[PDB]
Design an enzyme around this catalytic site. Structure first.
Site, PDB file in Angstrom:
ATOM      1  N   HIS A 232     -45.082   6.646   1.135  1.00 43.58           N
ATOM      2  CA  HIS A 232     -45.978   7.610   0.499  1.00 43.58           C
ATOM      3  C   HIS A 232     -47.287   7.937   1.191  1.00 43.58           C
ATOM      4  O   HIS A 232     -47.975   8.841   0.748  1.00 43.58           O
ATOM      5  CB  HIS A 232     -46.286   7.163  -0.931  1.00 43.58           C
ATOM      6  CG  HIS A 232     -45.073   7.063  -1.800  1.00 43.58           C
ATOM      7  ND1 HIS A 232     -44.305   8.158  -2.126  1.00 43.58           N
ATOM      8  CD2 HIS A 232     -44.503   6.003  -2.408  1.00 43.58           C
ATOM      9  CE1 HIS A 232     -43.314   7.774  -2.907  1.00 43.58           C
ATOM     10  NE2 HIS A 232     -43.403   6.470  -3.089  1.00 43.58           N
TER      11      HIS A 232
ATOM     12  N   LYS B  71     -32.735  10.019  -0.273  1.00 46.25           N
ATOM     13  CA  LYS B  71     -33.652   9.855  -1.399  1.00 46.25           C
ATOM     14  C   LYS B  71     -33.957  11.258  -1.914  1.00 46.25           C
ATOM     15  O   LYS B  71     -34.422  12.104  -1.157  1.00 46.25           O
ATOM     16  CB  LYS B  71     -34.941   9.147  -0.971  1.00 46.25           C
ATOM     17  CG  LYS B  71     -35.832   8.765  -2.149  1.00 46.25           C
ATOM     18  CD  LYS B  71     -37.123   8.089  -1.702  1.00 46.25           C
ATOM     19  CE  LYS B  71     -37.945   7.635  -2.916  1.00 46.25           C
ATOM     20  NZ  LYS B  71     -39.204   6.924  -2.525  1.00 46.25           N
TER      21      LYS B  71
ATOM     22  N   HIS C  20     -46.183   1.996  -6.554  1.00 46.07           N
ATOM     23  CA  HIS C  20     -45.197   3.057  -6.789  1.00 46.07           C
ATOM     24  C   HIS C  20     -45.924   4.382  -6.920  1.00 46.07           C
ATOM     25  O   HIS C  20     -47.071   4.416  -7.358  1.00 46.07           O
ATOM     26  CB  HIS C  20     -44.364   2.820  -8.056  1.00 46.07           C
ATOM     27  CG  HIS C  20     -43.601   1.529  -8.066  1.00 46.07           C
ATOM     28  ND1 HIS C  20     -42.506   1.302  -7.259  1.00 46.07           N
ATOM     29  CD2 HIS C  20     -43.761   0.406  -8.806  1.00 46.07           C
ATOM     30  CE1 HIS C  20     -42.036   0.088  -7.487  1.00 46.07           C
ATOM     31  NE2 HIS C  20     -42.779  -0.477  -8.421  1.00 46.07           N
ATOM     32  N   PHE C  21     -45.255   5.472  -6.550  1.00 43.82           N
ATOM     33  CA  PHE C  21     -45.796   6.803  -6.793  1.00 43.82           C
ATOM     34  C   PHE C  21     -45.118   7.357  -8.049  1.00 43.82           C
ATOM     35  O   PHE C  21     -43.908   7.550  -8.064  1.00 43.82           O
ATOM     36  CB  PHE C  21     -45.557   7.730  -5.592  1.00 43.82           C
ATOM     37  CG  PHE C  21     -46.333   9.024  -5.661  1.00 43.82           C
ATOM     38  CD1 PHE C  21     -45.860  10.094  -6.413  1.00 43.82           C
ATOM     39  CD2 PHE C  21     -47.531   9.162  -4.980  1.00 43.82           C
ATOM     40  CE1 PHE C  21     -46.571  11.286  -6.486  1.00 43.82           C
ATOM     41  CE2 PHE C  21     -48.259  10.352  -5.048  1.00 43.82           C
ATOM     42  CZ  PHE C  21     -47.779  11.413  -5.796  1.00 43.82           C
ATOM     43  N   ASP C  22     -45.888   7.600  -9.105  1.00 43.41           N
ATOM     44  CA  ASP C  22     -45.291   7.930 -10.394  1.00 43.41           C
ATOM     45  C   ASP C  22     -45.152   9.439 -10.590  1.00 43.41           C
ATOM     46  O   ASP C  22     -44.107   9.915 -11.039  1.00 43.41           O
ATOM     47  CB  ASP C  22     -46.100   7.334 -11.543  1.00 43.41           C
ATOM     48  CG  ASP C  22     -45.270   7.137 -12.793  1.00 43.41           C
ATOM     49  OD1 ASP C  22     -44.159   6.557 -12.683  1.00 43.41           O
ATOM     50  OD2 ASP C  22     -45.742   7.547 -13.881  1.00 43.41           O
TER      51      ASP C  22
HETATM   52  C1  LIG Z   1     -41.769  12.240  -9.647  1.00 41.22           C
HETATM   53  C2  LIG Z   1     -41.935  11.676  -8.291  1.00 41.22           C
HETATM   54  C3  LIG Z   1     -41.156  10.638  -7.839  1.00 41.22           C
HETATM   55  N1  LIG Z   1     -41.359  10.119  -6.580  1.00 41.22           N
HETATM   56  C4  LIG Z   1     -40.461   9.065  -6.164  1.00 41.22           C
HETATM   57  C5  LIG Z   1     -40.801   7.596  -5.787  1.00 41.22           C
HETATM   58  C6  LIG Z   1     -40.862   6.482  -6.649  1.00 41.22           C
HETATM   59  N2  LIG Z   1     -41.172   5.383  -5.818  1.00 41.22           N
HETATM   60  C7  LIG Z   1     -41.290   4.058  -6.315  1.00 41.22           C
HETATM   61  O1  LIG Z   1     -41.200   3.075  -5.312  1.00 41.22           O
HETATM   62  C8  LIG Z   1     -39.801   2.667  -5.150  1.00 41.22           C
HETATM   63  C9  LIG Z   1     -39.673   1.175  -5.331  1.00 41.22           C
HETATM   64  O2  LIG Z   1     -38.594   0.857  -6.203  1.00 41.22           O
HETATM   65  C10 LIG Z   1     -39.020   3.526  -6.151  1.00 41.22           C
HETATM   66  O3  LIG Z   1     -38.405   4.662  -5.555  1.00 41.22           O
HETATM   67  C11 LIG Z   1     -40.072   3.878  -7.199  1.00 41.22           C
HETATM   68  O4  LIG Z   1     -40.309   2.781  -8.071  1.00 41.22           O
HETATM   69  N3  LIG Z   1     -41.225   5.758  -4.595  1.00 41.22           N
HETATM   70  N4  LIG Z   1     -41.021   7.064  -4.520  1.00 41.22           N
HETATM   71  C12 LIG Z   1     -42.266  10.658  -5.777  1.00 41.22           C
HETATM   72  O5  LIG Z   1     -42.443  10.226  -4.671  1.00 41.22           O
HETATM   73  N5  LIG Z   1     -43.043  11.678  -6.206  1.00 41.22           N
HETATM   74  C13 LIG Z   1     -42.891  12.193  -7.438  1.00 41.22           C
HETATM   75  O6  LIG Z   1     -43.686  13.232  -7.861  1.00 41.22           O
END
Ligand SMILES: Cc1cn(Cc2cn([C@@H]3O[C@@H](CO)[C@H](O)[C@H]3O)nn2)c(=O)[nH]c1=O
Length: 124
Positions: free
Chosen positions: A12, A41, A119-121
């Site tokens: 991220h 992904k 995590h990015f939510d």
């Molecule tokens: C809605 C949304 C989801 N994601 C996915 C994500 C989640 N994560 C977290 O880290 C990982 C570890 O398990 C998983 O994909 C999630 O928990 N990483 N990418 C986005 O990047 N941007 C977003 O606007």
């Protein structure tokens, strides 16, 4: 071993460009950051701010995570981000992505000591 905080930075963080993500940015970045290894992904966001600024979000506006946990935090300021979304015609291993730049508040989940994003939510 890759820590959760390290994995967040790999998935991220892209501080190295202001925004200027070309139309092929996602195709390139999703591959290079190893997010197309076992599967395409389907969605992933890169944040183009300093690591310090992103880490600082963990002490900003506390909000509910999409999963109902209470450890998410929304940035007080908008941030430069790029969303990557798998195209409909995308076929593993040749993962293909639509690259969309935006300026929005990010929401991250934070954990640990030190308390850092893991995590990015969402972006709002
Ligand atoms: C809605 C949304 C989801 N994601 C996915 C994500 C989640 N994560 C977290 O880290 C990982 C570890 O398990 C998983 O994909 C999630 O928990 N990483 N990418 C986005 O990047 N941007 C977003 O606007």
């Amino acid at each position: 071993k890759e820590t959760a905080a390290a994995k967040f930075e790999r998935q991220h963080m892209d501080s190295s460009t202001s925004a200027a993500s070309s139309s092929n940015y996602c195709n390139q970045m999703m591959k290079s950051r190893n997010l197309t290894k076992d599967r395409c992904k389907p969605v992933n966001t890169f944040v183009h701010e300093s690591l310090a600024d992103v880490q600082a979000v963990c002490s900003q506006k506390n909000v509910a995570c999409k999963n109902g946990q209470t450890n998410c935090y929304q940035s007080y300021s908008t941030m430069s981000i790029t969303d990557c979304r798998e195209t409909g015609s995308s076929k593993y291993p040749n993962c293909a992505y639509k690259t969309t730049q935006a300026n929005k508040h990010i929401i991250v989940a934070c954990e640990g000591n030190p308390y850092v994003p893991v995590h990015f939510d969402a972006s709002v």
